[PDB]
């Protein structure tokens, strides 16, 4: 035999080990429209109808937003928009209320509850009305048979909705 000394500069004592990491995908939509009827005298919603263009999804990652349109997610080609229709607003007080409505994702429709929190009601310096409020709630992918081929392990069955609205009076 013969004896050797490592060249530390070109020797790597290495290892690879696989692990999992949980993180939240956060995202919104750039293109949507709403009709909003509200009574600042009573802090009640009368009509809230939202149409969201699935195409305009944004999770800050252009190749994912694209994949979201595919058959195994939104199927934007066949179901280009998702919609929410308020059916009933049960006021708790002037800050809080339970909102019930029909959400439709990829042509499947289900009634959901959102918690309305009114952040602010004002008459502007200009004399015209404004409001700020938030709707939030958890929906289940499984309830809408949404992205069914993706396991509830890889991607949570729960989606948390968070709608923040600033809005002004019309015409
Ligand atoms: C009223 C507002 C409704 C918003 C519902 C939006 C549902 C979005 C689901 C997104 C799923 C992201 C999947 C990421 C792929 C990684 C695996
Ligand atoms: S839009 C929205 C309203 C309220 C809350 N909240 O839990 O206080 C959230 C949230 O943090 O998910 C979002």
UniProtKB/TrEMBL annotation:
Domain Lipid/polyisoprenoid-binding YceI-like, chain residue ranges per copy: 3-168
Record-linked SUPFAM superfamilies: YceI-like
Keywords: Signal
Taxonomic superkingdom: Bacteria
Cross-referenced InterPro entries: Lipid/polyisoprenoid-bd_YceI, TTHA0802/YceI-like_sf
The keyword Signal belongs to this UniProt entry's keyword annotation: yes
Pfam families associated with the record: YceI (PF04264)
Keyword Lyase listed: no
Name listed for the protein in its UniProt record: Periplasmic protein
Organism: Campylobacter jejuni
Gene name linked to the record: yceI
